[PDB]
């Protein structure tokens, strides 16, 4: 009942830079993911 949905696992792309300030490219991470949980599978306990 648990499904892991992935389109892009991870993509660290160098971002736009303001050359007029001499600021380096914005390193930015990005992941397009999702999950599908359930209740039929799981049972809680105590201690």
């Amino acid at each position: 009942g648990f499904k892991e949905l992935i389109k892009r696992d991870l993509t660290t792309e160098v971002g736009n830079a303001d050359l007029s300030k001499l600021v380096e490219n914005q390193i930015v991470g990005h992941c397009y993911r999702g999950a599908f949980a359930a209740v039929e599978e799981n049972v809680q306990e105590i201690s």
């Binding site: 007029s20 300030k21 001499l22 600021v23």
Partner: protein, 49 residues
């Protein structure tokens, strides 16, 4: 030709300024200069006999 034509050319202008962390740098400028003009005349003489 009867009269020449002036030479043209573009030139960029910039100056390096001290750039302290995270300031905006000031841009340069472009400008053009032109040469002069010269012309050619005619001369002639002759004889009759």
């Amino acid at each position: 030709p009867q009269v020449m034509d002036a030479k043209w050319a573009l030139q960029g202008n910039c100056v390096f300024l001290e750039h302290i962390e995270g300031e905006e740098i000031k841009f340069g400028t472009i400008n053009a200069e032109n040469g002069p003009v010269a012309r050619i005349q005619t001369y002639a003489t002759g004889f009759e006999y």
